């Protein structure tokens, strides 16, 4: 229905309460639009997203249980209806070259933030793990 | 200097005479802005560029003698002054994924168009090689 309901209905489902909102983090870093890495941190800190993307428990390491769903939401957020996991993976490759995110070799769909997110976010990985009830 | 000088000076150097100008090719394919594969076909058919990129003589195979210069011009053409071969190399990977350009095994900076450029361009490799005095 209306936007008032959209907010209320989603608030009932415990949506829209991430610890690290992509939009807020973009204002902090001054990037304007949200970037992919900020979008991932938002899902990783949103309890309502732990079914398709979650922390593993080892530092800044995370896995995409449903890679297609992550590409689907990224497409919804950037108005890219033709977004799929092939294109999202292609983008993550540029994050590799920049030493922002690394692939965990030996696991499928598992990566790790290798930039100093602690000094950036002011959170340690374990702190967020407890806030999110990571197993 | 002025624009009339910029065009005359480049003319005296036998520049601006590529057999396959990226812009002309883009209009032919209706792609709008030039794409990387078109930009490469421009350098590869521009005699003033044979120092850093050229054909090898074996069909649609070519080598980047100065990979940095190729990434530098692609940067100037798309207003990406921070362009380098690492980013350009990911770009070529996209054409690998799409079976448009493959890597020559065991050789660095050596690629081959594996699409059907002869049907698209109306040229054979040997025809262009003769026009370009390829050794």
């Amino acid at each position: 229905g209306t936007f008032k309901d959209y907010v209320r209905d989603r608030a009932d489902l415990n949506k829209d309460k991430p610890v690290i909102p992509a939009a807020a983090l973009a204002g902090y870093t001054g990037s304007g639009p949200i970037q992919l890495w900020q979008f991932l941190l938002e899902l990783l800190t949103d309890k309502s997203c732990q079914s398709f993307i979650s922390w593993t428990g080892d530092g800044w390491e995370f896995k995409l249980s449903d890679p297609d769903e992550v590409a689907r939401r990224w497409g919804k957020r950037k108005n890219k209806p033709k977004m799929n996991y092939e294109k999202l993976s292609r983008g993550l490759r540029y994050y590799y070259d920049k030493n922002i995110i690394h692939k965990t070799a030996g696991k499928r769909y598992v990566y790790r933030f290798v930039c100093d997110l602690q000094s950036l976010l002011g959170y340690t990985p374990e702190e967020l793990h407890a806030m999110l009830d990571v197993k | 200097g002025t624009f009339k000088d910029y065009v005359r000076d480049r003319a005296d150097l036998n520049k601006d005479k590529p057999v396959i100008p990226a812009a002309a090719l883009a209009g032919y394919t209706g792609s709008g802005p030039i794409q990387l594969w078109q930009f490469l076909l421009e350098l590869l058919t521009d005699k003033s560029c044979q120092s850093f990129i050229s054909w090898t003589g074996d069909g649609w195979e070519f080598k980047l003698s100065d990979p940095d210069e190729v990434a530098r011009r692609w940067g100037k053409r798309k207003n990406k002054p921070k362009m380098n071969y690492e980013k350009l190399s990911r770009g070529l990977r996209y054409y690998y994924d799409k079976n448009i350009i493959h890597k020559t095994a065991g050789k660095r900076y050596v690629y081959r168009f594996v699409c059907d450029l002869q049907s698209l361009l109306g040229y054979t490799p040997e025809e262009l090689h003769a026009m370009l005095d390829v050794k």
């Binding site: 870093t29 970037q35 992919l36 890219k80 292609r90 540029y94 922002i100 | 980013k87 990911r90 770009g91």
Partner: peptide, 16 residues
Amino acid sequence: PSFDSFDFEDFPAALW
């Protein structure tokens, strides 16, 4: 650390 643009032909950044 810095976060340069992630904008390419095979992976274009959105804006508007």
